[PDB]
Short mmCIF file of all heavy atoms in Angstrom, two decimals:
data_model
loop_
_atom_site.label_atom_id
_atom_site.label_comp_id
_atom_site.label_asym_id
_atom_site.label_seq_id
_atom_site.Cartn_x
_atom_site.Cartn_y
_atom_site.Cartn_z
N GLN A 1 -3.32 -15.22 -9.81
CA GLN A 1 -3.58 -15.21 -11.17
C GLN A 1 -5.16 -15.20 -11.51
O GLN A 1 -5.49 -14.64 -12.54
CB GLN A 1 -3.03 -16.51 -11.79
CG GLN A 1 -1.61 -16.75 -11.67
CD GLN A 1 -1.03 -17.75 -12.45
OE1 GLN A 1 -1.58 -18.86 -12.50
NE2 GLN A 1 0.29 -17.85 -13.00
N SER A 2 -5.93 -15.57 -10.48
CA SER A 2 -7.39 -15.30 -10.65
C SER A 2 -7.96 -13.95 -10.30
O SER A 2 -9.12 -13.69 -10.45
CB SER A 2 -8.01 -16.44 -9.87
OG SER A 2 -7.97 -16.27 -8.41
N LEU A 3 -7.05 -13.04 -9.85
CA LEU A 3 -7.46 -11.74 -9.23
C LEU A 3 -7.12 -10.75 -10.30
O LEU A 3 -6.03 -10.32 -10.82
CB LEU A 3 -6.74 -11.37 -8.03
CG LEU A 3 -6.91 -12.46 -6.77
CD1 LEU A 3 -5.96 -11.96 -5.62
CD2 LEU A 3 -8.30 -12.54 -6.40
N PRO A 4 -8.25 -10.07 -10.79
CA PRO A 4 -8.22 -8.87 -11.66
C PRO A 4 -7.48 -7.64 -11.09
O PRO A 4 -7.33 -7.63 -9.76
CB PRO A 4 -9.64 -8.57 -12.00
CG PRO A 4 -10.58 -9.66 -11.66
CD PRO A 4 -9.69 -10.25 -10.51
N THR A 5 -6.98 -6.79 -11.88
CA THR A 5 -6.18 -5.55 -11.29
C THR A 5 -6.41 -5.08 -9.92
O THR A 5 -5.56 -5.04 -9.11
CB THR A 5 -6.42 -4.34 -12.26
OG1 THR A 5 -5.86 -4.69 -13.60
CG2 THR A 5 -5.60 -3.16 -11.84
N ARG A 6 -7.69 -4.70 -9.61
CA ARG A 6 -8.06 -4.09 -8.33
C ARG A 6 -7.88 -5.10 -7.24
O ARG A 6 -7.11 -4.82 -6.16
CB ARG A 6 -9.34 -3.53 -8.27
CG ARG A 6 -9.40 -2.24 -9.05
CD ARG A 6 -10.78 -1.59 -9.18
NE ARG A 6 -11.56 -2.38 -10.15
CZ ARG A 6 -12.77 -2.06 -10.59
NH1 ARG A 6 -13.48 -1.00 -10.04
NH2 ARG A 6 -13.35 -2.80 -11.50
N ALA A 7 -8.38 -6.41 -7.40
CA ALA A 7 -8.21 -7.34 -6.31
C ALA A 7 -6.76 -7.67 -6.13
O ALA A 7 -6.12 -7.86 -4.97
CB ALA A 7 -8.99 -8.62 -6.73
N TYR A 8 -6.05 -7.80 -7.27
CA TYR A 8 -4.58 -8.10 -7.27
C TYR A 8 -3.85 -7.16 -6.45
O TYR A 8 -2.99 -7.41 -5.64
CB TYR A 8 -4.09 -8.21 -8.75
CG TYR A 8 -2.62 -8.23 -8.79
CD1 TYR A 8 -2.04 -9.48 -8.63
CD2 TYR A 8 -1.71 -7.24 -9.04
CE1 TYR A 8 -0.68 -9.67 -8.70
CE2 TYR A 8 -0.40 -7.36 -9.21
CZ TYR A 8 0.12 -8.61 -8.91
OH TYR A 8 1.62 -8.77 -9.01
N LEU A 9 -4.08 -5.81 -6.74
CA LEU A 9 -3.34 -4.66 -6.06
C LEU A 9 -3.74 -4.81 -4.60
O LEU A 9 -2.84 -4.62 -3.73
CB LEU A 9 -3.65 -3.36 -6.69
CG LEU A 9 -3.00 -3.06 -8.11
CD1 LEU A 9 -3.63 -1.76 -8.71
CD2 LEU A 9 -1.51 -3.01 -7.97
N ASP A 10 -5.01 -4.99 -4.19
CA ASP A 10 -5.58 -5.09 -2.90
C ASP A 10 -4.85 -6.17 -2.15
O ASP A 10 -4.66 -6.05 -0.90
CB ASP A 10 -7.03 -5.34 -2.98
CG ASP A 10 -7.81 -4.08 -3.34
OD1 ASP A 10 -7.37 -2.99 -3.12
OD2 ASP A 10 -8.87 -4.26 -3.91
N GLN A 11 -4.56 -7.23 -2.71
CA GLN A 11 -4.02 -8.41 -2.12
C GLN A 11 -2.41 -8.30 -1.89
O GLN A 11 -1.94 -8.64 -0.82
CB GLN A 11 -4.41 -9.74 -2.82
CG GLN A 11 -3.82 -11.06 -2.18
CD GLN A 11 -4.48 -11.40 -0.70
OE1 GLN A 11 -5.14 -10.65 -0.18
NE2 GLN A 11 -3.96 -12.55 -0.26
N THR A 12 -1.82 -7.69 -2.85
CA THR A 12 -0.36 -7.64 -2.92
C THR A 12 0.39 -6.44 -2.22
O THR A 12 1.27 -6.68 -1.48
CB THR A 12 0.23 -7.85 -4.40
OG1 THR A 12 -0.24 -6.73 -5.10
CG2 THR A 12 -0.28 -9.09 -4.86
N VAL A 13 -0.04 -5.32 -2.57
CA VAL A 13 0.58 -4.04 -2.22
C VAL A 13 -0.27 -3.07 -1.24
O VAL A 13 0.37 -2.19 -0.56
CB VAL A 13 1.25 -3.28 -3.34
CG1 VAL A 13 2.35 -4.15 -4.06
CG2 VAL A 13 0.14 -2.74 -4.36
N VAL A 14 -1.57 -3.20 -1.35
CA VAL A 14 -2.30 -2.18 -0.51
C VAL A 14 -2.13 -2.29 0.95
O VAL A 14 -1.99 -1.28 1.66
CB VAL A 14 -3.87 -2.10 -0.98
CG1 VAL A 14 -4.63 -1.14 0.02
CG2 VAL A 14 -4.07 -1.59 -2.38
N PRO A 15 -2.10 -3.46 1.52
CA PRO A 15 -1.93 -3.57 3.04
C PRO A 15 -0.62 -2.95 3.51
O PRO A 15 -0.74 -2.11 4.45
CB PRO A 15 -1.98 -5.05 3.25
CG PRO A 15 -2.85 -5.62 2.08
CD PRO A 15 -2.45 -4.77 1.03
N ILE A 16 0.43 -3.20 2.83
CA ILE A 16 1.72 -2.70 3.33
C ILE A 16 1.87 -1.12 3.00
O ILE A 16 2.52 -0.28 3.61
CB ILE A 16 2.95 -3.48 2.63
CG1 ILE A 16 4.17 -2.85 3.41
CG2 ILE A 16 3.15 -3.22 1.31
CD1 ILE A 16 5.46 -3.63 3.05
N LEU A 17 1.10 -0.62 1.85
CA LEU A 17 1.07 0.72 1.54
C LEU A 17 0.24 1.44 2.59
O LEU A 17 0.68 2.58 2.94
CB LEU A 17 0.37 0.99 0.14
CG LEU A 17 1.32 0.72 -0.95
CD1 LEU A 17 0.62 0.76 -2.23
CD2 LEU A 17 2.51 1.70 -0.95
N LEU A 18 -0.91 1.04 3.10
CA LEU A 18 -1.63 1.61 4.20
C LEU A 18 -0.78 1.81 5.42
O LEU A 18 -0.66 2.88 6.05
CB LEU A 18 -2.85 0.93 4.42
CG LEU A 18 -4.03 0.96 3.43
CD1 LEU A 18 -5.12 -0.01 3.96
CD2 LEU A 18 -4.54 2.42 3.33
N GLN A 19 -0.01 0.72 5.82
CA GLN A 19 0.90 0.77 6.90
C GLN A 19 2.10 1.83 6.79
O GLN A 19 2.24 2.59 7.58
CB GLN A 19 1.36 -0.67 7.24
CG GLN A 19 2.12 -0.79 8.61
CD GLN A 19 2.50 -2.20 8.88
OE1 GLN A 19 1.58 -3.06 9.14
NE2 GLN A 19 3.83 -2.49 8.81
N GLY A 20 2.74 1.78 5.67
CA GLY A 20 3.76 2.58 5.34
C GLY A 20 3.35 4.07 5.31
O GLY A 20 4.03 4.91 5.68
N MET A 21 2.31 4.33 4.58
CA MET A 21 1.72 5.57 4.48
C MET A 21 1.34 6.25 5.82
O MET A 21 1.49 7.43 6.11
CB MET A 21 0.47 5.73 3.55
CG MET A 21 0.78 5.49 2.06
SD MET A 21 -0.64 5.01 0.90
CE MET A 21 -1.12 6.80 0.56
N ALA A 22 0.90 5.43 6.82
CA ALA A 22 0.54 5.99 8.03
C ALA A 22 1.89 6.34 8.78
O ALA A 22 1.93 7.43 9.43
CB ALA A 22 -0.21 5.01 8.93
N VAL A 23 2.90 5.57 8.61
CA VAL A 23 4.15 5.88 9.18
C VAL A 23 4.70 7.12 8.60
O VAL A 23 5.14 8.03 9.16
CB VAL A 23 5.17 4.74 9.08
CG1 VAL A 23 6.46 5.17 9.59
CG2 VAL A 23 4.82 3.44 10.00
N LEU A 24 4.73 7.11 7.24
CA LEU A 24 5.16 8.30 6.55
C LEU A 24 4.51 9.68 6.99
O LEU A 24 5.00 10.64 7.14
CB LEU A 24 4.91 8.18 5.01
CG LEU A 24 5.21 9.33 4.10
CD1 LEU A 24 6.75 9.60 4.15
CD2 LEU A 24 4.81 8.95 2.74
N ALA A 25 3.06 9.44 7.10
CA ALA A 25 2.30 10.78 7.53
C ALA A 25 2.63 11.25 8.87
O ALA A 25 2.33 12.41 9.32
CB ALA A 25 0.86 10.53 7.38
N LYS A 26 3.16 10.19 9.82
CA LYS A 26 3.56 10.66 11.15
C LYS A 26 5.07 11.13 11.24
O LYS A 26 5.33 12.12 11.86
CB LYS A 26 3.48 9.29 11.98
CG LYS A 26 1.96 8.89 12.30
CD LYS A 26 1.91 7.65 13.04
CE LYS A 26 0.40 7.21 13.09
NZ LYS A 26 -0.27 6.36 12.09
N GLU A 27 5.88 10.67 10.31
CA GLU A 27 7.26 11.10 10.27
C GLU A 27 7.61 12.36 9.45
O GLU A 27 8.31 13.15 9.94
CB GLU A 27 8.24 9.91 9.74
CG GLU A 27 8.16 8.55 10.48
CD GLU A 27 9.15 8.72 11.73
OE1 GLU A 27 10.20 9.23 11.57
OE2 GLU A 27 8.84 8.16 12.87
N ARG A 28 6.74 12.40 8.39
CA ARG A 28 6.94 13.63 7.53
C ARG A 28 8.43 13.84 7.14
O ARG A 28 8.82 15.08 7.35
CB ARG A 28 6.12 14.91 7.88
CG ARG A 28 4.62 14.33 7.94
CD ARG A 28 3.77 15.50 8.08
NE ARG A 28 2.39 15.07 8.26
CZ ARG A 28 1.27 15.83 7.95
NH1 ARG A 28 1.42 17.07 7.45
NH2 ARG A 28 0.08 15.12 8.24
N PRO A 29 9.13 12.87 6.63
CA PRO A 29 10.51 13.03 6.45
C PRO A 29 11.06 13.77 5.35
O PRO A 29 10.21 14.17 4.32
CB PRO A 29 10.96 11.59 6.35
CG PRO A 29 9.86 11.07 5.51
CD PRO A 29 8.59 11.63 6.18
N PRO A 30 12.21 14.36 5.13
CA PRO A 30 12.64 15.12 3.93
C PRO A 30 12.61 14.49 2.74
O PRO A 30 12.40 15.18 1.78
CB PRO A 30 14.23 15.35 4.39
CG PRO A 30 14.10 15.39 5.76
CD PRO A 30 13.16 14.10 6.30
N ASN A 31 12.63 13.13 2.54
CA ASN A 31 12.41 12.53 1.26
C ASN A 31 11.32 11.42 1.39
O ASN A 31 11.53 10.23 1.64
CB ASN A 31 13.77 11.96 0.79
CG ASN A 31 13.67 11.75 -0.76
OD1 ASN A 31 12.69 11.21 -1.24
ND2 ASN A 31 14.78 12.13 -1.55
#
């Protein structure tokens, strides 16, 4: 609740997004 938009996103979703995007870029799947 003390984290503004950017800090909030960075703490909540960016780490898993970086990991998932790396996998996605390696797999390059149909969807």
Side-chain angles (χ1 to χ4, degrees):
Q1 302 181 323
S2 71
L3 302 176
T5 296
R6 287 172 287 187
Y8 173 77
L9 289 169
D10 286 332
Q11 178 68 356
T12 62
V13 299
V14 172
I16 192 172
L17 284 170
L18 285 173
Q19 193 177 285
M21 290 164 87
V23 173
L24 177 66
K26 289 173 181 91
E27 297 279 321
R28 302 196 189 198
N31 198 318

